[PDB]
Write a protein that binds this ligand. Sequence first.
Ligand code: CLA
Ligand code: CLA
Ligand code: CLA
Ligand code: CLA
Ligand code: CLA
Ligand code: CLA
Ligand SMILES: CC(C)=CCC/C(C)=C/CC/C(C)=C/CC/C(C)=C/CC/C(C)=C/CC/C(C)=C/CC/C(C)=C/CC/C(C)=C/CC/C(C)=C/CC1=CC(=O)C(C)=C(C)C1=O
Ligand SMILES: CCCCCCCCCCCCCCCCCC(=O)OC[C@H](CO[C@@H]1O[C@H](CO)[C@H](O)[C@H](O)[C@H]1O)OC(=O)CCCCCCCCCCCCCCCCC
Ligand SMILES: CCCCCCCCCCCCCCCCCC(=O)OC[C@H](CO[C@@H]1O[C@H](CO)[C@H](O)[C@H](O)[C@H]1O)OC(=O)CCCCCCCCCCCCCCCCC
Ligand SMILES: CC1=C(/C=C/C(C)=C/C=C/C(C)=C/C=C/C=C(C)/C=C/C=C(C)/C=C/C2=C(C)CCCC2(C)C)C(C)(C)CCC1
Ligand SMILES: CC1=C(/C=C/C(C)=C/C=C/C(C)=C/C=C/C=C(C)/C=C/C=C(C)/C=C/C2=C(C)CCCC2(C)C)C(C)(C)CCC1
Ligand SMILES: [Fe+3]
Lengths: 340, 485, 65, 35, 38, 77, 60, 60, 30, 37, 34, 35
Amino acid sequence: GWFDILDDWLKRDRFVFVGWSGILLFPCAYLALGGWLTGTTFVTSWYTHGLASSYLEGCNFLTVAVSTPANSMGHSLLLLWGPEAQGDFTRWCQLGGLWTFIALHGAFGLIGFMLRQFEIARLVGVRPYNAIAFSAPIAVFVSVFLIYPLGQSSWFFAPSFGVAAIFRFLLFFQGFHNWTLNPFHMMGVAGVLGGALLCAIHGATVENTLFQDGEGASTFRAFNPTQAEETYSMVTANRFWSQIFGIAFSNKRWLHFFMLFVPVTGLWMSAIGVVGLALNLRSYDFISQEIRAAEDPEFETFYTKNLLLNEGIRAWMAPQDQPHENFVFPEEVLPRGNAL
Amino acid sequence: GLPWYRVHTVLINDPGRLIAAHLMHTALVAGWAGSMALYELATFDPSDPVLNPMWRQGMFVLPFMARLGVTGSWSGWSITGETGIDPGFWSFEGVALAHIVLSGLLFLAACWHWVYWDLELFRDPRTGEPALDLPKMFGIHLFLAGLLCFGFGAFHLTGLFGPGMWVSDPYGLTGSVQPVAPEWGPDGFNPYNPGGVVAHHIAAGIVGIIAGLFHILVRPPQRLYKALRMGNIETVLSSSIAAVFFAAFVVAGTMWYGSATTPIELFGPTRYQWDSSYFQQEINRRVQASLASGATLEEAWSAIPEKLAFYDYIGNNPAKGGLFRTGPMNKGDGIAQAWKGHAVFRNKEGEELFVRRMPAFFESFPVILTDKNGVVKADIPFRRAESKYSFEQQGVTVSFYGGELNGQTFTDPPTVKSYARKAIFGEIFEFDTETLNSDGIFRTSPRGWFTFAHAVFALLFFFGHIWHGARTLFRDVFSGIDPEL
Amino acid sequence: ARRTWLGDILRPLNSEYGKVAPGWGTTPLMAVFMGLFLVFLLIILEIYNSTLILDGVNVSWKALG
Amino acid sequence: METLKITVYIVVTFFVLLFVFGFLSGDPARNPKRK
Amino acid sequence: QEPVSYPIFTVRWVAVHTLAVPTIFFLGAIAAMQFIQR
Amino acid sequence: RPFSDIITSVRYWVIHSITIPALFIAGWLFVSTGLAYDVFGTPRPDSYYAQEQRSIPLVTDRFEAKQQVETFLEQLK
Amino acid sequence: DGIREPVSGSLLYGNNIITGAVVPSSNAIGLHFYPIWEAASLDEWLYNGGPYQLIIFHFL
Amino acid sequence: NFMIVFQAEHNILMHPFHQLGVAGVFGGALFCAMHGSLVTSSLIRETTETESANYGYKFG
Amino acid sequence: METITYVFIFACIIALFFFAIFFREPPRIT
Amino acid sequence: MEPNPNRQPVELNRTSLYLGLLLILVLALLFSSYFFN
Amino acid sequence: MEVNQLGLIATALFVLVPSVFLIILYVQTESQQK
Amino acid sequence: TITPSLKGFFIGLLSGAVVLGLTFAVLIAISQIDK
Ligand code: CLA
Ligand code: CLA
Ligand code: CLA
Ligand code: CLA
Ligand code: CLA
Ligand code: CLA
Ligand SMILES: CC(C)=CCC/C(C)=C/CC/C(C)=C/CC/C(C)=C/CC/C(C)=C/CC/C(C)=C/CC/C(C)=C/CC/C(C)=C/CC/C(C)=C/CC1=CC(=O)C(C)=C(C)C1=O
Ligand SMILES: CCCCCCCCCCCCCCCCCC(=O)OC[C@H](CO[C@@H]1O[C@H](CO)[C@H](O)[C@H](O)[C@H]1O)OC(=O)CCCCCCCCCCCCCCCCC
Ligand SMILES: CCCCCCCCCCCCCCCCCC(=O)OC[C@H](CO[C@@H]1O[C@H](CO)[C@H](O)[C@H](O)[C@H]1O)OC(=O)CCCCCCCCCCCCCCCCC
Ligand SMILES: CC1=C(/C=C/C(C)=C/C=C/C(C)=C/C=C/C=C(C)/C=C/C=C(C)/C=C/C2=C(C)CCCC2(C)C)C(C)(C)CCC1
Ligand SMILES: CC1=C(/C=C/C(C)=C/C=C/C(C)=C/C=C/C=C(C)/C=C/C=C(C)/C=C/C2=C(C)CCCC2(C)C)C(C)(C)CCC1
Ligand SMILES: [Fe+3]
């Protein structure tokens, strides 16, 4: 009646589509972006960590963030109307209400886009591989921004939206979990560099086996969008690659599926890796190495250097990185290379 | 033909064989359960429950049947700690062998159903090819579940025929199985209230009967039938999987933050109790209450339970340990024997010092002695000829109150350092590392393994969900598209 | 196919594979179960995270009998 | 260890000479078109 | 393209106007911050 | 529809050259009268410390968090 | 580090795959060309991180 | 070990060029994934639903 | 004990390269 | 038994055999370091 | 130092049973026809 | 009794319901106008 009217007004063709997914996607995405943009502009983090992170306080674009809540909030969501600000907007901004605001509204914007991709694919009449492929960034998002702080004691250890605050996350993860020495991260890095490797090489091969159909040196003008005749010699690409490297694709369908497969799996394996850290289960040691370095003090490996360096990262970043513990270390118990 | 990742697709259109496969799978899950129980009963030490409980020995399936009230062993020892019992048939072994017999029954039927797959029952009485009437089945199965859920909550948890369930006190010193009683109050929604769990299985029980009846009586609207691709079995798969990782994420969370149904006596303390100093506060409450009523320090601190001090130790914190450190918690730092007692460090002046205790985050933390204000008075310095606050220059002594070192003092610097560098771990115990060849590096808790695994599986079952949802909604547009030519 | 005693007992339960109910039917009745169930999930989640501070309910370990 | 210097130099020299003589030897007509 | 039975303000209208007034208001405020002495 | 049709029509100019300077001035005056400091409660660069509290303000309870920060602002820090 | 602290990077002297490496040339050797025949013995050519230069020049 | 000493002695993360390098790798990986999905979702029907989709291409 | 396991796996991987290159399934145009 | 027309063979080929062996082998080499600990 | 002899068995089964699984799958379909 | 959290919670439920109702009413009205 009115339902099929609401249907065909939404599912209609326009300069940019909306659909049923539009109803969830657009408010959530727009609020999350808008929140980050006002947070980086006016909002302090001086009542939480003792930082300044906004243009109003005098910070540049490389040092701003919408910073996390305080440690004493636990895992509270900090709702505007709730009994931690009691209907008050100023305190709600100071206590970090914008971080959770942005995080939840962005979490629903991701589901909106995911659904939007499904809907447009069902409409156009193609297979939905692009929506299955898009579950890797949502896996990463909910493993790093949601599951990891929910395994810890607060939102305080989650990464803050900002570039330098993510850099501090990199150093924190390296320092306290030795994150590069965990095999799931090895697999994620490999998967991602292999995605990057396939990108350059596939482009370079297709663009350097093109047929003559133009008049000018540029061959960008020899293309019509129809698929009636082939646009690059696949046979030649195979013959080339089987001879310079040893193995080659001889199946386009499989080549493009390999391109889908490598980085999405990489990110999935890394998502399993960071949920493993949320319980503080962390690959940090090989027991055989400790017992050996215990019985022989003139044994050295690069791994032992890395653990001494991890000591340096932790002991020197802990004071201003965990102010809620009110840590005070004397200057004589800080670790030093020259004291060894 | 079929590739290796679609080989189990000869059961999509054939019901008889599908039942057989499901039955055979259930027989494996049940056989594994029985066999795991037997395996853990071969590696449990029951003599010491105060300093060698189940959750320190890396027992995974043993607490789950102790949660509902099995406590007996035919050996005549219980996990509560009483000896010279008899439970009748139902011991740990009883359940353990019962699962073996059930596995066998299910395997025999699975063979039958694989062989006699063709029945008139699966054929349509109109078209004569295999169909299942899925809404009817949902109705019957919701009826079956609601009836059994109502039965479990009504007869088992109340102990009105059954045992009851395991309840404890806030500090997990005394824990038992008792009949519990329902609560329909608002407090029935507090997870730290047993009564609410009883009330649930009754209320949600009858709600399950009504809906189970409803779905058998009415027939689905045309609109939903066409919408969620009904009559295609593969959407039942997709919906059911969405429900599974809902449930998984909940049991990972309720286990990790703890609840009244994962007491701190069948899974050990949580980390949210170490960082909030849950047990240190009860210990202080008792000892100040003891000193105010009059007592000396020696008397007062020896009055503390061995259990309540044993929880106040970072080796029971499941946030310590690692991903590739294997075996029991005992394999990490030895089987506890006895308590050395509370350590009190003092300066030559006459002031009492306090050692800052280690956080969960670190893998080595500097040793610092502060006084009341919070300012450092002593430390063990990392630097090796530059010191101001070292124990030798300050004259630090250590005294013990309570336990086997009671009334003792140590005044030579190495022993004072030895006790202080392990005082950052909390209370001091004596451990035995020569009977499981422990190497002194922590191992994580069964609580922690549980929440790690179920989180991982939930994160994968989300992928499972969105893939099987796509297969049922793009069934007729797979195998490539008509290129409209 | 093969006829059996047990199949004959259970036969009327899988024969209605075709039947639907006309128009939108009960779909408006479902929509409030959606619904108030989701509101209930909110309530019990917000009690557990202590964003509702009801009198008589104290979410703590210090509530065990 | 002194013999080792000389035989490594001879090997290296042999390969670099094949290389240069190879590129003087008619390489711009080794293409499959316009040979 | 945006509809041809033409509602008075279409969907493109809110899309450009939820991104028009904040950025004009913002680059006027960010510019004022530059002339704060600090 | 192309920007060429939008960049020319007089009604476009008669709205815009009137609305945009008001918004530009509303945005300018918002920071320059110091109102952004009160509505977001961000400190001015003479109000991060006080002469009786020379350490960082830190919240340490979550239901009196409100009262704790109002105390720090009431004593003129 | 040219002050007599060797580093083990070989599997046979108790490393696994993750910790193993070919350990760079010595700080004492510098930017010098250091083949087998500019050393007094193979023993001390290996002691100064000899194979490191030998892999990388050929590889580049 | 190399990365960690490199970061300490020069702070490579605040160098704008390293930031373009990670953008190129993240974007390269990203364009690979979406290119793969868009092409494999547009394939023609020469197959059936018991034999893989990849036997629609017969070589060259 | 540990070194043998490692080198056996590396040896299997280079033998696989040889077999995969010189005993492939020959891709042939139709 | 009684013939069932739903049953079908599985097809595995030489290239997929190589890919699978390579994946199991590089996985083996990566995780042995942690299993031995 | 230490080698763990259950870790040995762990790799041994990990690399055996799927290689054996794959070698049987590849051999039975090539031993049949056209 | 009605704790302060219960008043804030009821306000947030009603205001969230209102947002969703007005947006759905807005889409129906505009779609139904230009049929
Ligand atoms: C569709 C888009 C959308 C979505 C999904 C959300 C979702 C959310 N918002 Mg948001 N919001 C939106 C649009 C949206 N908002 C818009 C347009 C604005 C501007 C007005 C806001 C402004 C806003 C603010 C300022 C905040 C939120 C917050 C929140 C979160 C807290 C819970 C909440 O309010 O849930 C939304 C929905 C409900 C609470 C209830 C829906 C109830 C329904 C479906 C039926 C009710 C039935 C019945 C009447 C019950 C009777 C019971 C009785 C008999 C006992 C949550 C993720 C907060 C947040 O992120 O905090 C961290 C926060 O600070 N919202
Ligand atoms: C037929 C009788 C029967 C009985 C009485 C038991 C009893 C027991 N089994 Mg066994 N088991 C059985 C059959 C049986 N089993 C079969 C057929 C299998 C094969 C799958 C198993 C597999 C099995 C395993 C794998 C294990 C046990 C274990 C145990 C113990 C578990 C207690 C516990 O904490 O459960 C806890 C169970 C839950 C919390 C599950 C709740 C599921 C819910 C929430 C789903 C709701 C879905 C529903 C449709 C929604 C609507 C409901 C409606 C009312 C509104 C207990 C002694 C455990 C053990 O330690 O054994 C030694 C264990 O790990 N059993
Ligand atoms: C007066 C009757 C009555 C009573 C006393 C109870 C009592 C209870 N019910 Mg129950 N119930 C009843 C009737 C009743 N029920 C009826 C009639 C129904 C309808 C069938 C239900 C349906 C119902 C459900 C579905 C659930 C309960 C749960 C609970 C418990 C809630 C408190 C708790 O432990 O939360 C503990 C946990 C929570 C409050 C968490 C809820 C989280 C939700 C809503 C979202 C999860 C999002 C996501 C998937 C998580 C991961 C995100 C990731 C990105 C990080 C409590 C014991 C819950 C339970 O047993 O938990 C163990 C649960 O899941 N009840
Ligand atoms: C993260 C992305 C995601 C995506 C893309 C999908 C996609 C799909 N789901 Mg699915 N689902 C998800 C997550 C997701 N789901 C989660 C987390 C759950 C809960 C366990 C479910 C449970 C579920 C079931 C049980 C079923 C589906 C079904 C479907 C399919 C069709 C229906 C549909 O699109 O509903 C998508 C619907 C939503 C994403 C819900 C949107 C909710 C909104 C609009 C309001 C939220 C309330 C309020 C405003 C905010 C509260 C905030 C709170 C934190 C306080 C489709 C393949 C069906 C299916 O597979 O049919 C074949 C089916 O049976 N879904
Ligand atoms: C919950 C039950 C469940 C069921 C009944 C199915 C059923 C099915 N899945 Mg499936 N799936 C599930 C969960 C499930 N899945 C989950 C959780 C995910 C996310 C990880 C997926 C992701 C998935 C994909 C992506 C694909 C399937 C496919 C298939 C179909 C093809 C036949 C098949 O299984 O190949 C039989 C497969 C084999 C014999 C090879 C398996 C070799 C391995 C990996 C075995 C490892 C065993 C494991 C370690 C044991 C522990 C299990 C643990 C959970 C307890 C079939 C309908 C395929 C399909 O739909 O084809 C059209 C396809 O492409 N599934
Ligand atoms: C979850 C959200 C998230 C978001 C949105 C960003 C965003 C960004 N990160 Mg970060 N990052 C994150 C999480 C996030 N990060 C996490 C979890 C980690 C891992 C720990 C990192 C680690 C990280 C590092 C180490 C670095 C970045 C950098 C960057 C910038 C990269 C620019 C680029 O080309 O990227 C690649 C992306 C693309 C090529 C996509 C297209 C971008 C363009 C051309 C168009 C933009 C269009 C529009 C404005 C946005 C989309 C709208 C939509 C409706 C279509 C960018 C601002 C770098 C940085 O800060 O540089 C200053 C850098 O060094 N990221
Ligand atoms: C003593 C010794 C030697 C000891 C060994 C030391 C050592 C470090 C050993 C290594 C072992 C190690 C630690 C491994 C760790 C990581 C590991 C186990 C990773 C695998 C797990 C993983 C990440 C899984 C998920 C992601 C994934 C699949 C990643 C793989 C990434 C990867 C390298 C991809 C291959 C990239 C590649 C080079 C492709 C070339 C393809 C090719 C032939 C293209 C040419 C081509 C292009 C065209 O366009 C067309 C048209 C045609 C026709 C054509 O042909
Ligand atoms: C294990 C890796 C193997 C890789 C194998 C494959 C790739 C390599 C293929 C080629 C391998 C063989 C290369 C040729 C080796 C030559 C032997 C060799 O090193 O001998 C020279 C070696 C050098 O011996 C070195 O001596 C050093 C001190 O100077 C140290 O003691 C070293 O440890 C010792 O190795 O000596 C011997 O082998 C014993 C003495 C031999 C005396 C007869 C030599 C020939 C005499 C006539 C030619 C003299 C030339 C120099 C003078 C010129 C005129 C002034
Ligand atoms: C329940 C517990 C007990 C169970 C019983 C014991 C354990 C059983 C274990 C079974 C394990 C099976 C795993 C099989 C893997 C086979 C893989 C496979 O066949 O792929 C190839 C397969 C098959 O591919 C298809 O095969 C078909 C049938 O032959 C046709 O030929 C198709 O055209 C072809 O494309 O592809 C897929 O399955 C798609 C998903 C991708 C799979 C991985 C691709 C390979 C990627 C290589 C990455 C190498 C990384 C190097 C890293 C270097 C680091 C320095
Ligand atoms: C928070 C909040 C909210 C929301 C809000 C919003 C939504 C806002 C928005 C806002 C916005 C929305 C903003 C925007 C801004 C913008 C900007 C900031 C821009 C920038 C730009 C630039 C910077 C440029 C650059 C360039 C380019 C781009 C190109 C080239 C050239 C150049 C370089 C020049 C609400 C109310 C709901 C509630 C309360 C709270
Ligand atoms: C027939 C019969 C019988 C028998 C029975 C039996 C004997 C049973 C049991 C059996 C058993 C004996 C069972 C068991 C099983 C097992 C299983 C089922 C397993 C599984 C496993 C798994 C699956 C694993 C996995 C994993 C891994 C490997 C690693 C990591 C982790 C995881 C978990 C993932 C009798 C005498 C009664 C009589 C009648 C007939
Ligand atoms: Fe391409």
